[PDB]
Design a protein around this ligand. Structure first.
Ligand SMILES: [Zn+2]
Ligand SMILES: [Zn+2]
Lengths: 151, 151
């Protein structure tokens, strides 16, 4: 079992929350660290528009990794990826599962993260936001949920 | 200081050594882990032919990351990149420094690794192989050597 849990610091949570409400095609970059107990600490999340990473994406990631490392004193890095599900259920689409899968070909403890304000019940007057953390598992891959906590 | 030292297990060393002798354009992928003391453990190295990673490169990396994690029990990942300097000095070319620099925009503790059997003295009868570990540091980037040990 690669990752036991994911500790998401409250500020990075609020960022994902704010974009989950956007309700509009982008993807986020989770930045933080991993400790002895296979726990992924996410201190910040940056949201921007085979495996390829644009120089625009690199500079944004590096800038926050600098700001975080300068704050904490510890070295930071990209540990996960975020995107929103405003028009579908919070669960990872089969594309997300196959995407996360090839991400794990590099970090193996890499993490998939999804927020969703979507509600199919069109008669309820009650607000809802879901957030799940997932990975991937011959033959096809499938979702495996990772416990996620907020600090 | 992102990384204190690099612990390179003896078998991964021999691999880099074997290709350093090839004397012939490829690049290697260092696979391992990082611990509390900012030490990069490299358990294996795979050598194959903006930031882009081919699906051919991904499958190779994942396969060894599986084999290592199955052996050690701990989760593995890509921690560095290797290439040989058979026709130049062991020191990182300015391209290597700029390459390593944008690698660090993702991992920050990511490591550059170079082996070299090159000897400019054409009158000496004595064999030599150098290996250095480096990173990158507004304005231009420059080489910063990382201590490297073999297990
Ligand atoms: Zn999706
Ligand atoms: Zn070079």
């Amino acid at each position: 079992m690669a990752v036991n849990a994911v500790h998401l610091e409250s500020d990075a949570f609020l960022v994902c929350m704010n974009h989950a409400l956007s309700t509009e095609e982008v993807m986020g970059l989770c930045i933080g660290e991993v400790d002895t107990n296979r726990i992924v600490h996410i201190h910040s999340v940056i949201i921007l528009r085979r495996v390829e990473i644009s120089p625009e994406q690199l500079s944004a990631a590096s800038t926050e990794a600098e700001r975080l490392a300068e704050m904490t004193g510890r070295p930071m890095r990209v540990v996960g990826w975020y995107h929103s599900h405003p028009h579908i259920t919070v669960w990872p689409s089969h594309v997300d599962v196959r995407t996360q899968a090839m991400y794990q070909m590099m970090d193996q403890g890499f993490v998939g993260l999804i927020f969703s304000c979507f509600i199919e019940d069109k008669n309820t007057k009650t607000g809802r936001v879901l957030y799940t953390c997932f990975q991937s598992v011959g033959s096809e891959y499938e979702r495996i949920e990772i416990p996620i906590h907020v600090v």
